[PDB]
Structures are given as structure tokens and as C-alpha cells.
């Protein structure tokens, strides 16, 4: 209800900020006392109800929101004297930036200090400068949100884990509104290398089980797949909301980087299609966590990534390939290899066309030449059969799993 700005002005700010003064001991000293993630959630809710803007105390005295309103003598004496060891947000940025490359295990301050950033700077960015909505803006930039968000993804990238992690859930769920703005340069910057890191998380690691199948080995690789499936739920729910707010521009402007994302996530789905053990490992966390998976957006998240991106990947391919895509769908019924269907389609390249015979078709790629894509220069036969190779198997697996 956005009542936090005014309804706690008079010494409730001081009393809660005293808890901010004492929060260092919850992490600086550890004898026995576990509750730090739950304490971090309760702590993170204070940033949502943070009236005072403490990015710069001087601009805070410029702004209307505690010394300014009443007489400052009665408050006694300085705003920074309350917490002389306060973490400056620029200094916190440097701290997480240096700590991102290290990425060691809980870095225990990330569980409590990282949700300050997502709970506060998204909460204050629209309020203050670098946000088109009369006194000076007290706060942060949109590029600051972009930079730290690159480090958020880098923190999850470095903290892979080998057997256990139970902290990605709250941090990924908490950092929802930062994905809402999501200026488009970050796709080139971080997400394509990050999804490449997920490709490296695949590529004989997801396929660890099949080498052993050439019962104990399946149990061991299933235990490793627990970490993998948790990492999929770390990266995906940020990606879904980012895809929703940027699929329109990917369709209108054909992005090459989106082409690489389409084939990579399709490779992940192809591993998911035949891997029954991966489906059982997926079944473990959904029933353990009891997540509806409705407000976040059978009700799988991996298939949601595929289907939500599938307009973009289909938009890359031309309409002339559609008849050959039907032929390719029949080709995968034989369970042929990727090279077999590739060459069997490449040598029989004259089967496509049918431009003049069907006027209803002619209208279709009359649009396709009208897109920003150019004429037949980049679309060589190799890229064309590459599109066939991806999409034919994708619709085969999706059509089978559609039948519930």
C-alpha cells in the first residue's frame, strides 16, 4: 500500500536502523546460531519499508523524507553517526563485483546483504534519478541495476555447487521486479555467455548417465542431477519474465543471439526428452517444494521455456521450409542420426519451393521477404538444414508429450 514512506517517521526509523547497526554480528561472529536465510528474508522486508534514502545522506537532507522534518536538536548528532560502518551502495557494488569472481561457499553475507540490493534499489529507482516518472533525487542508475544484475547472474554461475544448495529459491523469487525493466544490452552482455555456461553445464554432464548405461551409476548421477535441476530453476524463472517483456522485439528485429539461445535451450529440451531419470529428478523438487508454478509465469518450467521461445525460433526459419519440416518430422520417425537426416534433406533440396502452384503459399513468403532479413545471401543450404535439424526433433518430442 506504499505507506512505508510516512507512517513510521518518528523514532521507528531509529529503532529499526539500530537493528541495522546490530546486523553485522549475524554473520561476523558464528558460535552456533541456521536462521540467517529466514532472518535475511525478514531483513529484506525492511528495505521494502525503508522511508529514509541513505544512498547519500546529504541529498537525503535535500529530500523531504528524518532530520529535516522535526528540529534536528530534538533528534539528538548526525545521520551517518548512527551507523558509521554503513555499506555504501557503490561500495557494495564493488564488494559484490570482486566477490562474484571468487564465488566461494556461504560469502555468508550474500544471504542477507544481497537481498538489500534487490529489495531497495528496485524499490527506489523509480522514486529517484535515472527514471522518468522537484527537490534533488536522493538515490542509483538503470545501468546500476543492469550492472548488479549481471553480477547476480554471475553469482549463480560461480556458485554451481556439487551436492547441495538451498538458497537460490528465495533470491531468484525475490529479484522479480529487476527483470521488469531489463534494458536490452544485457542480452549481449551476460545472458548469452551465461546460457553458454548452461550449455557447458550440459554437454556430457547432463549426459553422464548414458555413459554408465553402456543401477548404482544412475543413483550417483541422479544425485548430481539434483544440483543441475535446482540450477535450472535458478536461471529459468528470471528468463521467463525476461522473455515475456522482450519476445516482441526479438520477433520484430531478428536477433542472432536469440538464434543461439533457441538452439541451446532446444538441446537442453532434447536431453530432457529421452532422459527418464531427469524427469524423475524434476519430479522430486516440484513435489518437495510444492510450487504451483502459475503465479511465477505437466506444469513443467523447462517445456515452458521451449514453447515460449518457439515463436522466435520458428520465425527465423522461412515458410518455404515448412513442407520440408513435415518431411523431416517423418524422417525422425525412423530414429535416424542427425547427420543422416541432414544429408538426406540436403541432397534432396529440390523438394522445397511450390511457390507458383499454391497462391495461398505465395502470399506467405511475400511477407517473409518484407522483414528486415535480407535476400538469399546468408541463408545458405547449411544453415537451412541446421534449422531443419533443430525444429523437426523439437516438434516430434513436443507432439509426443502433448498427449497427457
Amino acid at each position: 500500500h506504499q505507506f512505508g514512506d510516512d507512517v513510521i517517521l518518528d523514532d521507528v526509523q531509529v529503532s529499526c536502523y539500530r537493528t541495522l547497526c546490530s546486523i553485522y554480528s549475524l554473520g561476523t561472529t558464528k558460535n552456533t546460531y541456521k536462521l540467517r536465510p529466514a532472518l535475511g528474508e525478514c531483513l529484506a522486508r525492511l528495505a521494502a519499508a525503508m522511508p529514509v534514502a541513505f544512498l547519500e545522506p546529504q541529498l537525503n537532507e535535500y529530500n523531504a523524507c528524518v532530520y529535516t522534518t522535526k528540529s534536528p536538536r530534538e533528534r539528538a548528532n548526525s545521520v551517518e553517526e548512527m551507523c558509521p560502518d554503513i555499506p555504501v551502495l557503490d561500495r557494495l557494488m564493488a564488494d559484490i563485483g570482486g566477490l562474484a569472481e571468487s564465488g566461494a561457499r556461504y560469502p555468508h553475507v550474500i544471504e542477507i546483504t544481497l537481498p538489500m540490493l534487490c529489495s531497495y534499489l528496485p524499490r527506489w529507482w523509480e522514486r529517484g534519478p535515472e527514471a522518468p516518472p522537484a527537490p534533488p533525487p536522493c538515490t542509483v542508475t538503470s545501468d546500476h541495476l543492469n550492472s548488479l544484475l549481471g553480477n547476480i547472474l554471475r553469482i549463480i554461475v560461480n556458485n554451481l555447487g556439487i551436492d547441495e544448495a538451498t538458497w537460490m529459491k528465495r533470491l531468484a523469487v525475490f529479484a522479480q521486479p529487476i527483470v521488469s525493466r531489463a534494458r536490452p544490452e544485457l542480452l549481449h552482455s551476460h545472458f548469452i555467455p551465461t546460457i553458454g555456461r548452461l550449455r557447458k553445464r550440459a554437454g556430457k554432464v547432463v549426459a553422464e548417465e548414458e555413459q554408465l548405461r553402456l543401477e548404482e551409476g544412475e543413483l550417483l548421477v541422479r544425485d548430481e542431477f539434483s544440483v543441475l535441476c535446482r540450477d535450472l530453476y535458478a536461471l529459468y524463472p528470471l528468463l521467463i519474465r525476461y522473455v515475456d517483456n522482450n519476445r516482441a522485439h526479438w520477433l520484430t528485429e531478428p536477433n542472432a543471439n536469440a538464434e543461439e539461445l533457441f538452439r541451446m535451450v532446444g538441446e537442453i529440451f532434447i536431453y530432457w526428452s529421452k532422459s527418464h531419470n531427469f524427469k524423475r529428478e524434476e519430479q522430486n523438487f516440484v513435489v518437495q517444494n510444492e510450487i504451483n508454478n502459475m503465479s511465477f509465469l505437466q506444469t513443467s518450467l523447462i517445456v515452458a521455456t521451449l514453447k515460449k521461445m518457439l515463436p522466435i525460433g520458428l520465425n527465423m526459419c522461412a515458410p518455404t521450409d515448412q513442407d520440408l519440416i513435415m518431411l523431416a518430422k517423418t524422417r525422425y520417425a525412423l530414429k535416424d542420426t542427425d547427420e543422416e537426416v541432414r544429408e538426406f534433406l540436403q541432397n534432396n533440396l529440390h523438394l522445397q519451393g511450390k511457390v507458383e502452384g499454391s497462391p495461398s503459399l505465395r502470399w506467405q513468403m511475400a511477407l517473409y521477404r518484407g522483414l528486415p532479413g535480407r535476400e538469399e545471401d546468408a541463408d545458405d543450404p547449411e544453415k537451412i538444414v541446421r534449422r531443419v535439424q533443430e525444429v523437426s526433433a523439437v516438434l516430434y518430442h513436443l507432439e509426443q508429450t502433448e498427449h497427457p
Binding site: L251, T252, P311, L314, N315, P359, S360, W363, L367
Partner: protein, 869 residues
């Protein structure tokens, strides 16, 4: 007998937005003057003629749609009974030729002046031309609606309607009292000619469908001000309020720069009211206390609560600062109460604002109704001018600040808790030829303004007079309320601003329907994507649209890809495509007319049933009505009629004249005027429900004369011969026929005036009986005079109907005679190409010039009996 065909030109008309009317006293003294100029001839553009006419327009009878009509060919301005105009050589009122003798007889030649004058006191429409006036007027017509000027035009004319505002130099002078929009005509809005009841307008990007226009205050120009005690607490607080308004008045005076003096002067700015009550003059004191008490009475005119509060005015006294700026000539500077800590209260501020408007209403009544002076006055309005309304609201807001600063709370009695609509939401669709029996397509819609509108798909049997999605025959989505409509409107979607191009969608392969917003898929509340699964195909579907009153739409059916706004949906990647893929033409589209057009009774209407009772020797054959004795169908009184027509004999006096009378059981004296010309008129009757048999029409009286028979045994209702052009709507009917021709001569005493235009020539049965029920009413009018063929002692109705039983004296009821009932609304089809001309800036300059050049025509299927096209 058979149908007929002929080419026919457009007839179209435009209006100034100049509304008048006889209110209960605020009629603005009923006096305006016309002026027209034409600078062309064009007697025969292509085939037929040119159709320039000028006349009045009463806002009720008019929806001159381009196409068919209630006659032969187009809708003449004059064709309807609610139409009074003139061509140049003759006039039409009710689609009747009526030439008038005058000097300089001709059509509308180039470089001519024509005008008119109207009086709201006595109905008197008189016309005049260049040089001298015409010898003909109108009189004796109902005026229960507004009036405004109009001009008709077919094509090939470049006329200009010089009004009178600044450039309308009246060459032919007006009489006294008729002036061009003096007081407040053109209320707050710049003048601009408009089409009459438009439903299609060209935009820059494309055409825009237009919903119906509301009645712009069709009556009730006279306003509705609020409409007696004196307790002691109210006495003291109104005395305090009197002091507050007086000191604020003195503050406003000295802020303006008005010093105090005994006499009233303007240069020196003196006024004798500028003294406190301890030495103010007594009339000023009485005046001050009077409107202070009236303001408090208006504040609690209704059941507003007020009571004891310990007199907090003395408790919390505050006073405004007094520098020398407030210093007054006498010395008694104002001392307003500094009660500025009163912030606001919305409901009571609005109530005080409309009570100030009621103060203005009574003030205007005193100024005009009892004063009837002249501003070399102002109309009683409610929201005419925003500047004056803001000033009054600010003054009364300072008053309310003082009132609530006293500490006297107030709330409304019950928080301030559809008489004749005539205009439902207009409905649009494609024809049945474009029905999608099987397939999967896409289209989209845009609307400039948000409002009541629904878009989607529907089966092709959409009966009108039903809101879209109120029955099983539609699957529309309405966003303004925010719920997808069907039998039970479940919540779905959201509102949407002036924009948000909606992409409607359908898939019959898997039986699914979805909708989109802002070129993006919409999400439901129930965790699903537009749950309309498992829908029977039936006879296919087609796109449909609707528009609320005053709203605007833009339905791009996707004739080409480039015209589509967004088209960013996933369907283009897969087998889905747009709707309007590849046609040479655009889709023709259909729309509904609120013409109250006749139609036959359905065979199995659920509430109503009828019967064709065969005759015996005891009685001739009879048509019997029936009705369920509950039904939830005690609706408005019905307008029923029998099928075939009866033209009067000939226009050849005593040769072919006929008479007109009605007889119940003896010779009554209605004296309904016989017309004399051919003038076909139908059977007609009306009847309200009584939860019984109601009535039964019969053909009787085969002895020596023709005579309708109308039995009735349960109530009082109207049952006498009708007209042919009958289309009044649906309401409790009384005294709606109108008009008498004031045909004149050069002496202005011409003996050619003649009551006519019996649209509903029905005698009212409210007056004839007065008795306590169980009646045996057998009302029976007689128009067929019947020349005696084989007199011979002893002329049925059926002899005159069919023109092949004149020799037959016995009555008969062939199957073509059928009872028929009046629908309020029916479907239609607009032209593919509207009149592109008549868009010359809607009045350019130098008297609002309008240009019309190009030709365009229909053919016709003019039925001989029904007299439409």
C-alpha cells in the same frame, strides 16, 4: 403485384448543430431565421435529377440512412411525417406533392436566397424566397422534441449555408425578433456542420465505425432546481454565515478596487453595501440574511443530518491577518475567519456545487421567466461554461470551508441515489456468405475511445435487440467492464486505454478461441488461455463487432499485411493466417437499423400464439390472438397490423373522394379526416396484455357496407385503421400524429388548408367507454364507402383487398392475410462505396461552404404493396 427495378441517386443531408425547442418557459422566445445560397444548376447530373431541399428537423423521426426508405427511392427530406422542407417549386411533408402558387416559380436556380421563420408559441412555419414570400405555411403539429435547420443534397452541388453569425449577410431581411444565435446558442462549442446520425466516417489510416449519438437534451431545457423550518441553532449559525459572506463580499469588493460610497458609481467604484451589519442599510441586511438562509436551506433541503456540537465556533476562534491591503474607505475592513485548515470533502462539495447550480437555475428563472428581458439573457444551463462554473465553485468552496470550519458535519440522505432510450448499441457483422464453416483465421480491431464495445466471433443467426454474448450465439469479449460474455459473464481480461489494438482469434481444428491486447496474448484469472474449449462448429462463425453510444471503432479486417498494426502474434509462424487474405473487393459488412420496421409474427414466438378461426353461418372467419397468462411478458403495448394494403380509389369532386368515420354501436363523431388522394393506409390496432385471450380480429358486415370488426372483452386499448409510414418506436402511445398544411395565396387567406398526414389515424378508446369491466366491446370502423353494385336490399372487406373478388359479396380470408407485428430493429447492409463527396471541410468559410460533385447510385427492389426500397 410483381417487383420493380429502377436506378436511383443518393439523397443526403447535413445539419448545423443549432438546437432549439419549446420548454416550460426557457424556450429562448422561439425566433430564428434561415439563409441559403446556391451557385450552380446541374439539373441532370447523370440520369435522374438533383435533390436540393431545405427545411426543419425535429431530432426524433430521423435516421436517414443511405439506401432504402419508407417510400419510393431515397429518403426525401420531407418524406417522413417528421420533416418540413421545400424544394424551390413545391414542398413535401410526409412524401406528398403540394405545389404552391407564387411569382417567379422555378426550382432552386443559381444565385437565389431562401429562408424561413418559426414560432414556438403557436406552430407556424413560414418560408420566403428572393423578392417576395411564398404563399404557404405549416401549422398544428406536435413540438415535444427539439428543432434544427437542415439542407438536402444529392450530388453535383456546391452550395453554402450562410447562417447569420458574422458572414451571413441577410439580403432578404428578417422580421423583428428573429436573430442569429444571440444569447447562448452555439453552447460553448465552435459551430460545425455534421452528418445527421452518422455511422461511418473516413479516417486518414482507414474508415471508422461510429456508434449512436445520444439525445443532446431532447427536452428539459428548463432545469430542475432543488425544491421550511427555522430552528435556533440554524438561526445562529446562519447569522454567522451571513457575517462571513458579507465580510468576504467586502473583501472581494476592495480587492477589485471598490471603495465605499452612498451612491453607486462605476468610475469611482462606489457602492452602499460596504458597511458592517451594525450600520449597514436595512434592505442590504435583509437581502444578506435572506440568501444566507436560503443557502443553508439548500444545504439541508433533503434529509441531511445535523445536531448538537457544543458550539465549537467560539471554542476554536481564528482570524485572518489584516495588513493595510484590507483597509476600507469607511474603516470597517473585513475580518474573515482563518479556517483554511479545512482540506476538502468530495461529496458535499459536489452537492454544494449543484446546489449553486440550483441557485443559478432559480436566478435564471427570475431573470427570464418573470423578467423576459434582453441582452441587446442567458440560457438555464448546468455545465455550459467552465470558467463561470469554476468561479461559482471557488466562491462556494470558500463558503464550504467556513461551514466545515464552524464544525458542522453533513452527509447526503442516501448517498444521492432509462426512461426512453431509442438507441441500443449498434451491431456490425459480415454477411452469411463469408461464414467460416471450417478453418482457422485471425483479425484485429482498434477503437479510438474506450467504452461499451464487444469484439469476437459469432454464429450467423444473430437476432438483433439482444446484447452480444447475452445468448449462446456469440463468444465476444468486453474489456471495459472486463469480462468475457456468454450465458453467465465470467470475469476475464481488464480495461484498456484509448489504444490497445485487440487481435481476435479462432481455431476450429482444436475448437479454441483466444484474444490479445497490445499485440500480446491475454491471460485469464482461472489459470488458462481463454477457456472456450469444446465448442460445436455448427453452421460456422464469422467476425462481429459492437459500439456503445458515442464511441468510435476501427475494424481492420486484414485485407493486407501492411495495414495490420502489430501482427506480432505466434499464429503467423504456424498454420494460422489473417481473415481477409486475398479478395479483389473488401468485405461488404452488415449493420443494424433502429428503424421501427414492420415484420410478420413468428410462427412459434414463445409468449404469443394466434389462430385463424374458420367461419360458419353463426359468424364469418376470425383471426384469434392468444397469450400466456403470466409469461414475464407484460411488455409495452404492441403495434400489430394486418398484411395487405388498401389504396383509396383514385385521385380523380365526388368522383373518388371517400369519407372517414368510426362506429362502435351507434354513430360516434370522431370525424377523422379523409385524405381523398390514393394515400394507402393499412389496418392497424394495439392491445396491452391482460393475461387472457386479449382480442380477436374478424371480417364481418357483408350486408351493404365494408367494416372492420374488433372484438375486445378484457381492457381498454386502441383499435382503428393506421397508415403506411408508421414507425414511431415502442412506448405508451397518445397524440403522436401531427401536421396540417397551411396552403396560402397572395392575399394570405387561401382556402386550401387541409388536415392530413394520418400516420396513426387511430381514435383513442380511452374516452369512449367508462364502465366496470365484463364488456362486450365490438368497435368497428368503416372506410370502404362502397358504391352500390347490385343494391337490391340484402360489401365485405375482402372484395377491396385482392382486386379479384369485387363481384363476390361474401367475406373471405385467404392465407395471404396474416397478422403482423412491429419489430423495433432489423438488419441491413451498407453500401460498399459511401458518398466520398460531401466532405468539403464540413463547412469551410464565408458561410460554411459545402461541395458535392461525383455521382453514385443504387438499383431497387421497390415492393408495390409495402412502399419501401
Amino acid at each position: 403485384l410483381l417487383l420493380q427495378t429502377n436506378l436511383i441517386n443518393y439523397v443526403t443531408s447535413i445539419r448545423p448543430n443549432i438546437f432549439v425547442g419549446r420548454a416550460e418557459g426557457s424556450t429562448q422566445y422561439g425566433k430564428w431565421y434561415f439563409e441559403v445560397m446556391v451557385d450552380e444548376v446541374v439539373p441532370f447530373l447523370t440520369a435522374q435529377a438533383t435533390h436540393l431541399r431545405v427545411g426543419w428537423a425535429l431530432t426524433e423521426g430521423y435516421s436517414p440512412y443511405p439506401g432504402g426508405g419508407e417510400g419510393w427511392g431515397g429518403n426525401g427530406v420531407g418524406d417522413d411525417l417528421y420533416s418540413y422542407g421545400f424544394d424551390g417549386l413545391h414542398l413535401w411533408t410526409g412524401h406528398v406533392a403540394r405545389p404552391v402558387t407564387s411569382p417567379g416559380q422555378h426550382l432552386l436556380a443559381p444565385e437565389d436566397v431562401v429562408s424561413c421563420c418559426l414560432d414556438l408559441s403557436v406552430p407556424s412555419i413560414s418560408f420566403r424566397i428572393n423578392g417576395c414570400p411564398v404563399q404557404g405555411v405549416f401549422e398544428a403539429f406536435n413540438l415535444d422534441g427539439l428543432f434544427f435547420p437542415v439542407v438536402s443534397f444529392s450530388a453535383g452541388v456546391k452550395v453554402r449555408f450562410l447562417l447569420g453569425g458574422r458572414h451571413g449577410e441577410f439580403k432578404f431581411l428578417p422580421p423583428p425578433g428573429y436573430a442569429p444565435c444571440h444569447e447562448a446558442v452555439l453552447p460553448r462549442e465552435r459551430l460545425r456542420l455534421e452528418p445527421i446520425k452518422e455511422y461511418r466516417r473516413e479516417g486518414p489510416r482507414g474508415p471508422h465505425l461510429v456508434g449512436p449519438s445520444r439525445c443532446l437534451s431532447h427536452t428539459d431545457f428548463v432545469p430542475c432546481p432543488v425544491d421550511i423550518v427555522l430552528p435556533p441553532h440554524l438561526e445562529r449559525i446562519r447569522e454567522k454565515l451571513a457575517e462571513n459572506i458579507h465580510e468576504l463580499w467586502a473583501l472581494t469588493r476592495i480587492e477589485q478596487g471598490w471603495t465605499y460610497g452612498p451612491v453607486r458609481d462605476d468610475n469611482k467604484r462606489l457602492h452602499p453595501c460596504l458597511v458592517n451589519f451594525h450600520s449597514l442599510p436595512e434592505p442590504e441586511r435583509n437581502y444578506n440574511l435572506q440568501m444566507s438562509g436560503e443557502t443553508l436551506k439548500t444545504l439541508l433541503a433533503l434529509g441531511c443530518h445535523v445536531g448538537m456540537a457544543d458550539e465549537k465556533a467560539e471554542d476554536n476562534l481564528k482570524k485572518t491577518k489584516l495588513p493595510k491591503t484590507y483597509m476600507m474607505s469607511n474603516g470597517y475592513k473585513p475580518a474573515p475567519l482563518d479556517l483554511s485548515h479545512v482540506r476538502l470533502t468530495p461529496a458535499q462539495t459536489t452537492l454544494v456545487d449543484r446546489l449553486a447550480e440550483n441557485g443559478h437555475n432559480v436566478w435564471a428563472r427570475d431573470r427570464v421567466a418573470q423578467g423576459w428581458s434582453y441582452s441587446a439573457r442567458l440560457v438555464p444551463y448546468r455545465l455550459l461554461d467552465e470558467a463561470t462554473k469554476r468561479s461559482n465553485r471557488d466562491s462556494l468552496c470558500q463558503a464550504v470551508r467556513t461551514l466545515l470550519g464552524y464544525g458542522y458535519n453533513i452527509e447526503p440522505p442516501d448517498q444521492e441515489p432509462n426512461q426512453s432510450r431509442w438507441d441500443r448499441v449498434r451491431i456490425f457483422r459480415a454477411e452469411k456468405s463469408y461464414t467460416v464453416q471450417s478453418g482457422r483465421w485471425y483479425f484485429e480491431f482498434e477503437a479510438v475511445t474506450t467504452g461499451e464495445m464487444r469484439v469476437g466471433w459469432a454464429r450467423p443467426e444473430l437476432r438483433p435487440d439482444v446484447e452480444l454474448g447475452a445468448d449462446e450465439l456469440a463468444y465476444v469479449f468486453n474489456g471495459h467492464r472486463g469480462q468475457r460474455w456468454h450465458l453467465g459473464s465470467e470475469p476475464f481480461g481488464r480495461p484498456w486505454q484509448s489504444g490497445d489494438v485487440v487481435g481476435c482469434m479462432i481455431d476450429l481444428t482444436e475448437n479454441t478461441i483466444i484474444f490479445t491486447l497490445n499485440g500480446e496474448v491475454l491471460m485469464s484469472d482461472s489459470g488458462s488461455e481463454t477457456a472456450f474449449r469444446e465448442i460445436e462448429i455448427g453452421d460456422g462463425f464469422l467476425p462481429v463487432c459492437s459500439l456503445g453510444p458515442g464511441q468510435v471503432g476501427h475494424l481492420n479486417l486484414g485485407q493486407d499485411v501492411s495495414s495490420l498494426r502489430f501482427f506480432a502474434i505466434c499464429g503467423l509462424q504456424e498454420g494460422f493466417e489473417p481473415f481477409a487474405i486475398n479478395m479483389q473487393r473488401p468485405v461488404t459488412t452488415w449493420f443494424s437499423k433502429s428503424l421501427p420496421q414492420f415484420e410478420p409474427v413468428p410462427p412459434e414466438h414463445p409468449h404469443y400464439e394466434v389462430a385463424r378461426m374458420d367461419g360458419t353461418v353463426d359468424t364469418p372467419p376470425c383471426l384469434r390472438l392468444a397469450h400466456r397468462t403470466w409469461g414475464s411478458q407484460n411488455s409495452l403495448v404492441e403495434m400489430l397490423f394486418l398484411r395487405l394494403s388498401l389504396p383509396v380509389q383514385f385521385h380523380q369532386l365526388n368522383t373518388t373522394t371517400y369519407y372517414y368515420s368510426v362506429r362502435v354501436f351507434a354513430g360516434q363523431e370522431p370525424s377523422c379526416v379523409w385524405v381523398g388522394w390514393v394515400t394507402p393506409d393499412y389496418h392497424q390496432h394495439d392491445m396491452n396484455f391482460d393475461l387472457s385471450k386479449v382480442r380477436a380480429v374478424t371480417v364481418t358486415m357483408g350486408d351493404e357496407q365494408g367494416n372492420v370488426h374488433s372484438s375486445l372483452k378484457c381492457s381498454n386499448c386502441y383499435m382503428v385503421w393506421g397508415g403506411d409510414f408508421v414507425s414511431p418506436g415502442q412506448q405508451g402511445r397518445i397524440s403522436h400524429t401531427d401536421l396540417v398544411i397551411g396552403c396560402l395565396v397572395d392575399l394570405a387567406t387561401g382556402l386550401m388548408t387541409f388536415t392530413a398526414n394520418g400516420k396513426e389515424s387511430n381514435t383513442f378508446f380511452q374516452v369512449e367507454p367508462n364502465t366496470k369491466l365484463f364488456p362486450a366491446v365490438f368497435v368497428l370502423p368503416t372506410h370502404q364507402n362502397v358504391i352500390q353494385f347490385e343494391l337490391g336490399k340484402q360489401m365485405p372487406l375482402s372484395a377491396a383487398m385482392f382486386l379479384s373478388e369485387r363481384k363476390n359479396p361474401a367475406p373471405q380470408c385467404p392465407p395471404r392475410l396474416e397478422v403482423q407485428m412491429l419489430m423495433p430493429v432489423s438488419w441491413s447492409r451498407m453500401p460498399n462505396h459511401f458518398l466520398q463527396v460531401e466532405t468539403r471541410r464540413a463547412g469551410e468559410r464565408l458561410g460554411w461552404a459545402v461541395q458535392c460533385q461525383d455521382p453514385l447510385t443504387m438499383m431497387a427492389l421497390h415492393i408495390p404493396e409495402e412502399n419501401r426500397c
